[PDB]
Design a protein around this ligand. Sequence first.
Ligand SMILES: Cc1nn(C)cc1-c1cnc(N)c(O[C@H](C)c2cc(F)ccc2C(=O)N(C)C)c1
Length: 293
Amino acid sequence: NPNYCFAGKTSSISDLKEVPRKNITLIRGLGHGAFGEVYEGQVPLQVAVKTLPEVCSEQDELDFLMEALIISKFNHQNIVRCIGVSLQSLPRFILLELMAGGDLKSFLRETRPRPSQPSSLAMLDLLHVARDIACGCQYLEENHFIHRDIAARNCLLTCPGPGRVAKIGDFGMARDIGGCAMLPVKWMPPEAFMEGIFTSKTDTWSFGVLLWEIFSLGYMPYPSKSNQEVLEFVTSGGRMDPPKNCPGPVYRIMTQCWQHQPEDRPNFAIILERIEYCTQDPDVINTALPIEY
Ligand SMILES: Cc1nn(C)cc1-c1cnc(N)c(O[C@H](C)c2cc(F)ccc2C(=O)N(C)C)c1
């Protein structure tokens, strides 16, 4: 058993809440997570079940055990809860809070305002998603945990509807810490992909890119640019333009997050202050989002 330390405490696989396999029942697949499936399931309690391929290397497994350890020790409303694990049967299961809304990136793409659904999403919705994740980022920051891949694809939503809550839901990056084309360089600050240096200011840069993902309604960052072109571009002082219709106050948060010097980039308390100010600002939240035909 590997060790894990967080918030002043070491824990071990023994600390994971084993749920007996007989209590768990798979319902439907939900998606392929590169390595292994995720199911909807019941334990009645509804769950997403992250599975470990029965055929996998020893590292695949440690990664898996490690991810459970990480997610279980977090306690916050914008970080996905772990109901427990089922390690004592194959395939091994990690049991998570079922997030009906699915991942944030898919959500933004499929629920973009449309001619048929002209107002499926408003500025205030995105502002609320942003605040949610930044609040989870605040929680990580003040516990000295560096996520390393804050991006829309690693965020989930409780429900499709307006009372939706965004949480951070994947931690397989801070877990692995692969190759160049694997690293998410489009979400990375310059010192991270140049020097391998990670601090809390890493997540601030990444959060700016996520902010861009959110307000563009789910686009790939630096549109039309490859990883290497981004690397040179970002390294030369280039930054993304505002997404379609983005309010200037919101774009300003992004650019503040994309400061070359990490010590010049805000901490998440400041970012929250600024997002709160945007939600209060009628010129921001009255701004209509683009309808794609
Ligand atoms: C409903 C629903 N629809 N969809 C499309 C996904 C769900 C869903 C609901 N609740 C979860 N807890 C959950 O977790 C997984 C581990 C996950 C977490 C994450 F942050 C990013 C992606 C995934 C993912 O979907 N993978 C294949 C890796 C998935």
